């Protein structure tokens, strides 16, 4: 995985600079709004006892990564679908086209969408994502896992998101922007160029989350 290997080097690099051990830390100088992601996971539901993991992206599209490792993505138009086999083979359809083999997985995706709409808050709700151009497209969830401290969400556009359980802080790392968006415990959303975080330093909070991230990316690469 090219994206993951780049991301591992970026994180090894920023951690190696020990960005929180400085006389002057000026984290705000490493902030770059041109680096804001196009997509992140807004809501998620782990029902992997029975079906798999449902999620919502910040655009209101929803997806499910089923226990058979297939995904079904419903776009924010409420109709257009993308189906991905275990091997990454993608199909493009619509609900209204009525694909017999998908009808049940579509019902299930609809029960996830409803659940999340009813009950869950939209992470990064106030935030405008960057406008994607013709080189980017809507990603699916390639894989995920939970540790005792977080859920780790790996999207097909190379982004890795990590949502921390006890404090509700979140990271969105993109290896192409080589950036990290940190959602802090006040729900402030800020995006940093990782290379500038090496230059200007960062808080102990963010630095410690970035060490954690490096470890989780190592876990993603092994598997």
């Amino acid at each position: 995985d090219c994206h993951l290997s780049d991301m591992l080097q970026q994180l090894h690099s920023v951690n190696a600079s020990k960005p929180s051990e400085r006389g002057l830390v000026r984290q705000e100088e490493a902030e770059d709004p041109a680096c804001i992601p196009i997509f992140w996971v807004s809501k998620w539901v782990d029902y992997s006892d029975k079906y798999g993991l449902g999620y919502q992206l910040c655009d209101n599209s929803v997806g499910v990564l089923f226990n058979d490792s297939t995904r079904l993505i419903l776009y924010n138009d409420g109709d257009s679908l993308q189906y991905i086999e275990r091997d990454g083979t993608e199909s493009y359809l619509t609900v209204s086209s009525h694909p017999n083999s998908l009808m049940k997985k579509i019902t299930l995706l609809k029960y996830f969408r409803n659940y999340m709409s009813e009950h869950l808050l939209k992470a990064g709700a106030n935030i405008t994502p960057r406008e994607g151009d013709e080189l980017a497209r809507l990603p699916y969830l390639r894989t995920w896992f939970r540790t005792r401290s977080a859920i780790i969400l790996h999207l097909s556009n190379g982004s890795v998101q990590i949502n921390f359980f006890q404090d509700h802080t979140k990271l969105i790392l993109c290896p192409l922007m080589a950036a990290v968006t940190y959602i802090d415990e006040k729900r402030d959303f800020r995006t940093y160029r990782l290379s500038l975080l090496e230059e200007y330093g960062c808080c102990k909070e963010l630095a410690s989350r970035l060490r954690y991230a490096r470890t989780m990316v190592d876990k993603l690469l092994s598997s």
Partner: peptide, 7 residues
């Protein structure tokens, strides 16, 4: 189930 942050 387990879920992200509720309302």
């Amino acid at each position: 189930l387990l879920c992200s942050t509720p309302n």
